[PDB]
Write a protein that holds these residues in place. Structure first.
Motif, PDB file in Angstrom:
ATOM      1  N   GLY A  12       0.820  -1.206   0.000  1.00  0.00           N
ATOM      2  CA  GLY A  12       0.000   0.000   0.000  1.00  0.00           C
ATOM      3  C   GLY A  12       0.855   1.257   0.000  1.00  0.00           C
ATOM      4  O   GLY A  12       0.393   2.325  -0.411  1.00  0.00           O
ATOM      5  N   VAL A  13       2.106   1.133   0.462  1.00  0.00           N
ATOM      6  CA  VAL A  13       3.039   2.278   0.566  1.00  0.00           C
ATOM      7  C   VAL A  13       3.693   2.553  -0.785  1.00  0.00           C
ATOM      8  O   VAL A  13       4.103   1.627  -1.476  1.00  0.00           O
ATOM      9  N   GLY A  14       3.783   3.831  -1.150  1.00  0.00           N
ATOM     10  CA  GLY A  14       4.378   4.236  -2.433  1.00  0.00           C
ATOM     11  C   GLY A  14       5.886   4.036  -2.473  1.00  0.00           C
ATOM     12  O   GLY A  14       6.522   3.885  -1.425  1.00  0.00           O
ATOM     13  N   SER A  15       6.447   4.041  -3.679  1.00  0.00           N
ATOM     14  CA  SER A  15       7.899   3.824  -3.900  1.00  0.00           C
ATOM     15  C   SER A  15       8.730   5.118  -3.981  1.00  0.00           C
ATOM     16  O   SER A  15       9.974   5.076  -3.958  1.00  0.00           O
ATOM     17  N   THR A  16       8.039   6.253  -4.090  1.00  0.00           N
ATOM     18  CA  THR A  16       8.674   7.560  -4.161  1.00  0.00           C
ATOM     19  C   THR A  16       8.902   8.117  -2.759  1.00  0.00           C
ATOM     20  O   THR A  16       8.278   7.684  -1.781  1.00  0.00           O
ATOM     21  N   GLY A  17       9.798   9.091  -2.674  1.00  0.00           N
ATOM     22  CA  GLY A  17      10.188   9.675  -1.408  1.00  0.00           C
ATOM     23  C   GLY A  17      11.322   8.883  -0.813  1.00  0.00           C
ATOM     24  O   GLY A  17      11.834   7.960  -1.422  1.00  0.00           O
ATOM     25  N   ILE A  18      11.698   9.257   0.399  1.00  0.00           N
ATOM     26  CA  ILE A  18      12.835   8.691   1.089  1.00  0.00           C
ATOM     27  C   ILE A  18      12.358   8.087   2.399  1.00  0.00           C
ATOM     28  O   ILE A  18      11.604   8.708   3.135  1.00  0.00           O
ATOM     29  N   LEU A  19      12.766   6.855   2.651  1.00  0.00           N
ATOM     30  CA  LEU A  19      12.500   6.181   3.906  1.00  0.00           C
ATOM     31  C   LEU A  19      13.731   5.342   4.216  1.00  0.00           C
ATOM     32  O   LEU A  19      13.902   4.245   3.670  1.00  0.00           O
TER      33      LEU A  19
END
Lengths: 110, 110
Positions: A12-19
């Motif tokens: 459900g979590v997107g692949s963009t951004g930083i984690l």
């Protein structure tokens, strides 16, 4: 010691951004920036990601604040840190939909 | 169990907004709402409040996120939690000036 590394993102979590997380001098550091998350209904908690095996299980547990963001508007989020990874709660009166989340947290290992 | 109690604010810290903590079942909760803090340079730390002696010695340590706020604009603040109290850090590359801070955190004692 472990360099900046991607958390394994929950479904459900997107692949963009930083984690990412890292360990330096025995303190785990976590950062999340513009992570797209699924809909978070009021008083619900949804997973965001999990720590790769390399980090181990002796990780700290606590709760802190973050933000939800969409369309120019920031909302208060609840971040759960534990060995189980990072999850995000919605403390607000309406569902948090099509939002990204951001936070940063750190604590000594166990 | 300690009810909601105002922290003692460190020098330079404003009088408006709310800064308090409570203990319910071995877990401490701390929240700040629109607390005026001193100018903080990038990577420097400014004291905000201290716990009354009722809360004891066995308090946790971790850094979490909060917000800085002035003139309708929010930025990432860092929140420093310890036995020593609450203090605020600046993860931004410019100085955070004329800001109020809001945050919420919690962890088990010990």
């Amino acid at each position: 010691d472990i360099p900046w590394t991607d958390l394994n993102r929950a479904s459900g979590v997107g692949s963009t951004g930083i984690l990412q997380a890292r360990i330096i001098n025995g303190v785990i550091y976590v950062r999340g920036n513009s992570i797209p998350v699924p809909n978070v209904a009021p008083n619900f908690i949804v997973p965001v990601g999990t720590f790769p095996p390399a980090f181990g299980t002796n990780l700290p547990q606590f709760d802190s604040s973050g933000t939800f963001y969409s369309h120019g508007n920031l909302s208060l989020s609840l971040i759960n840190m534990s060995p189980s990874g990072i999850a995000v709660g919605n403390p607000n009166n309406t569902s948090m939909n099509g939002k990204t989340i951001s936070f940063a947290l750190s604590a000594p290992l166990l």
